[PDB]
Amino acid sequence: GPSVFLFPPKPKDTLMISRTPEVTCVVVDVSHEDPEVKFNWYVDGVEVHNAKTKPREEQYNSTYRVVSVLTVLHQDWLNGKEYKCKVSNKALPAPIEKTISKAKGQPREPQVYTLPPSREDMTKNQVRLTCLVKGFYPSDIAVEWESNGQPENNYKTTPPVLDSDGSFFLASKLTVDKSRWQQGNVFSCSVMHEALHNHYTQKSLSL
Amino acid sequence: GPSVFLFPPKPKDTLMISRTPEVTCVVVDVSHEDPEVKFNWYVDGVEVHNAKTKPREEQYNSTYRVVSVLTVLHQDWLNGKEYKCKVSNKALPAPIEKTISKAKGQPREPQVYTLPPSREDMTKNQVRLTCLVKGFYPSDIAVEWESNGQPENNYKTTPPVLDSDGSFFLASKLTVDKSRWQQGNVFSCSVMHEALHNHYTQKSLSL
Amino acid sequence: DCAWHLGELVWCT
Amino acid sequence: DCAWHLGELVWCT
């Protein structure tokens, strides 16, 4: 049987208006016998036809893979608008329906703390700058790292962990060359969450 | 005031017996005035004394940062044993207590699908191999990439997204040089989840 | 007021 | 039977 995947849009996309948030509907393991896939898109019940559908790509048990992407609107998704994808195939007993929407519950602003390089780290060849985030709802968040108005891509961020009370937390960790840190450069911790004024806050870090 | 962070252990650590899973208790923004921090560790109520506590590191508003790590046992955590950290400071109105434990609910085995390079990707200088995982509980999972019994580190994996029914899903994406893919090399998708026999499954991908 | 990110606009209140 | 990972042991049932 063919499985369906309905991905929510990148939290950075839903929070940056210069970007376009999109819900993706992936269909995997689609057979040679019945390879046609018909996508239906719904918003709270109301069907929409604006969606774009890419051609097929090959798979392994000599099968196919189909993808349909639907532009959603920033203000729309953030309200908690329910998005539905109806996938139909001749090899399907019935039409398959997946549903994804921004999580309900009282939204909360994240707190951001910065942890400068450790005493050990400072002896090593590269240092790790750390950014700790806690008390946020929903888990939709986008932590990124920048230095001198340019991106720093050499970082890793844990998935949002559920807090005991009901909020979320995570840790992001940028690894930089020590000489760059020692040279006095400032490194910023960009956090984009729904419950942030202008969806943006920034704590930075310098020697 | 000083904030407390209680991190659960790496899902790879809790699933590999050759590794040691550890719960971390971070304490941030600790003042010069009252910098002593007393850690208390509890397991379902029972205090434990095996914990190790690292020395302080400096912070920014001329404050300090303390960390305490407690070795937990593989079989222990997986049962859903509740872990508690009690942080005490002279600048604290009362002792602060954070609590973290493996999520309750019926555990479920993840399904793993592989998506070979797209028709577009195959023209570009590097290709992206994809691994799609769905229907798993709890969200504790460790997706990694390997080729010829050696690690592939050039990948990114989305956080577990909550499914409509109640399980989880995610996508991991390895970017490799096209020549290596074209040269016929096999690339494996290592998934480690609680509800896997031996905590391990592997789907691989070759031209 | 508008917050930006590395050149691209984030959000305006 | 034991499952391994890049040399290190994962788990044994």
Q: How far apart are CA A44 and CA A72, in angstroms?
A: 12
Q: Which residue from A135, A22, A143, A137 is spatially nearest to A77, judged by alpha carbons?
A: A22
Q: How far apart are CA A110 and CA A168, in angstroms?
A: 8
Q: What is the DSSP letter of B108?
A: B
With beta carbons under 8 A apart, name residues in chain C contacting A149. 6-7
Give kind and range of the element (H or E) at residue B12.
helix B11-15
Facing residue for B115 by CB, picked from A65, A100, A139: A65
Radius of gyration of chain C (CA): 6
Q: Which residue from B200, B78, B196 is spatially nearest to D3, judged by alpha carbons?
A: B200
CB-CB contact of B21 with B14 (8 Å):
yes
Smallest CA–CA distance from A28 into chain B, residue: B113
Q: Which residue from A25, A65, A57, A36 is spatially nearest to B119, judged by alpha carbons?
A: A57
Phi-psi region of A149 (alpha: psi -120 to 50; beta: other; left: phi over 0): left
DSSP annotation string for B127-146: EEEEEEEEEEBSS-EEEEEE
Q: Which residue from A40, B161, A150 is spatially nearest to C5, judged by alpha carbons?
A: A150
Q: Does A169 touch chain B (CB under 8 A)?
A: yes
* Structure-solving method: X-ray
Q: How far apart are CA B155 and CA B157, in angstroms?
A: 7
Q: Which two tokens stand for residue D1?
A: 């039977």
Facing residue for A149 by CB, picked from C2, C6, C12: C6
Q: How far apart are CA A6 and CA A86, in angstroms?
A: 10
Facing residue for A17 by CB, picked from C1, C6, C9: C9
B162 burial type by CB count under 10 A (0-12 exposed, 13-18 middle, 19+ buried): middle
The residue to which tokens 């399907």 are assigned: A92
**D11 with B198: Cβ contact below 8 A:** yes
| Partners of residue B188 on adjacent β-strands | B146, B204
Q: Does A146 touch chain C (CB under 8 A)?
A: yes
Strand-strand pairing, B155-157 and B168-177: antiparallel
Widest CA span in chain B? 64
The residue to which tokens 């407690």 are assigned: B70
Q: Which residue from A17, A37, A9, D10 is spatially nearest to B14, judged by alpha carbons?
A: D10
Q: What is the DSSP letter of B110?
A: P
Does residue B138 have a cis peptide bond before it, meaning omega lies within 30 degrees of 0?
yes
Rounded to the nearest 5°, which phi and psi values hold at A26? -95, 140
Q: Which two tokens stand for residue A157?
A: 């961020």
Facing residue for A16 by CB, picked from C1, C8, C13: C8
**B159 with A139: Cβ contact below 8 A:** yes
What is the SS3 assignment for B104? coil
With beta carbons under 8 A apart, name residues in chain C contacting A150. 6
Give kind and range of the element (H or E) at residue B28.
strand B22-30
**A192 with C2: Cβ contact below 8 A:** no
**C6 with A15: Cβ contact below 8 A:** no
- Interacting residues of B171 by C-beta distance below 8 A, sequence separation 6+: A5, A7, B130, B131, B132, B133, B157, B158
**Amino acid at residue number B73:** L
Q: Which residue from B149, B195, B70, B111 is spatially nearest to D11, judged by alpha carbons?
A: B195
B203 half-sphere exposure, CB direction, 13 A CA radius: 16
Q: What secondary structure, in 3-state letters, does B146-198 show? A: ECCCCEECCEEECCCEECCCCCEEEEEEEEEEHHHHHCCCCEEEEEEECCCHH
- Cα B170 to chain centroid distance, Å, stands at 14
Q: What is the DSSP letter of B105?
A: S
Chains C and A touch each other (3 or more Cβ pairs < 8 A): yes
Give kind and range of the element (H or E) at residue B58.
strand B57-58
Number of C-beta neighbours around residue C4 at 10 A: 15
Strand-strand pairing, A3-7 and B155-157: unpaired
**B16 with D10: Cβ contact below 8 A:** yes
* B102-207 topology per CATH: Immunoglobulin-like (2.60.40)
Q: Which two tokens stand for residue B94?
A: 């009362």
Q: Which two tokens stand for residue B205?
A: 């991908």
A174 burial type by CB count under 10 A (0-12 exposed, 13-18 middle, 19+ buried): buried
Q: How far is CA C3 from CA A14, A76, A133, D13, in A?
A: 15, 20, 20, 54
The residue to which tokens 């700058």 are assigned: A129
CB-CB contact of A52 with A24 (8 Å):
no
Which of B 2-61 lie inside 8 A of A, CB atoms?
Answer: 3, 5, 7-8, 26, 28-29, 55, 57-60
What count of CB pairs under 8 Å joins A to C? 40
The CATH code that applies to domain A2-101 is 2.60.40.10
- Interacting residues of B104 by C-beta distance below 8 A, sequence separation 6+: B80
Q: What secondary structure, in 3-state letters, does A63-76 show? A: CEEEEEEEECCHHH
CB-CB contact of B22 with A80 (8 Å):
no
**A18 with C10: Cβ contact below 8 A:** yes
Hey, CA dihedral for A9, A10, A16, A19, is it positive or negative? negative
Q: What secondary structure, in 3-state letters, does chain A show? A: CCEEEEECCCHHHHHCCCCCCEEEEEEEEECCCCCCCEEEEEECCEEECCCEECCCEECCCCCEEEEEEEECCHHHHHHCCCEEEEEECCCCCCCEEEEECCCCCCCECCEEEEECCCCCCCCCCEEEEEEEEEEEECCCEEEEEECCCCEECCEEECCCEECCCCCEEEEEEEEEEHHHHHCCCCEEEEEEECCCHHHCEEEEECC
* Residues in chain C whose C lies over 2.5 Å from the next residue's N (breaks after): none
Hey, CA dihedral for A5, A8, A11, A17, is it positive or negative? positive
The torsion angle over the Cα atoms of residues A181, A160, B132 and B181, rounded to 10 degrees, is: 10
What is the SS3 assignment for B79? helix
Hey, CA dihedral for B195, B198, B199, B202, is it positive or negative? negative
Widest CA span in chain C? 19
Give kind and range of the element (H or E) at residue B76.
helix B74-79
- Cα A6 to chain centroid distance, Å, stands at 13
**D11 with B199: Cβ contact below 8 A:** yes
* Residues in chain D whose C lies over 2.5 Å from the next residue's N (breaks after): none
Q: Where are the domains of chain B?
A: 2-101, 102-207
Q: Which residue from A37, A38, A30 is spatially nearest to A65, judged by alpha carbons?
A: A30
Q: What is the DSSP letter of B102?
A: P
- Interacting residues of B183 by C-beta distance below 8 A, sequence separation 6+: none
Same fold, A2-101 and A102-207: yes
| Long-range contact set of residues A120-126: C-beta below 8 Å, sequence gap at least 24 | A122/A178, A124/A178, A125/A177, A125/A178, A126/A175, A126/A176, A126/A177, A126/A178
Give kind and range of the element (H or E) at residue B126.
strand B126-136
Which of B 74-93 lie inside 8 A of A, CB atoms?
Answer: none
Q: How far apart are CA A150 and CA A180, in angstroms?
A: 14
How far away is chain C from the Cα of A200, in angstroms, using its nearest Cα? 7
Q: How far apart are CA B83 and CA B45, in angstroms?
A: 8
- Interacting residues of B80 by C-beta distance below 8 A, sequence separation 6+: B101, B102, B103, B104
* Residues in chain B whose C lies over 2.5 Å from the next residue's N (breaks after): none
Q: How far apart are CA A200 and CA C2, in angstroms?
A: 10
Number of C-beta neighbours around residue A156 at 10 A: 11
What is the SS3 assignment for B11? helix
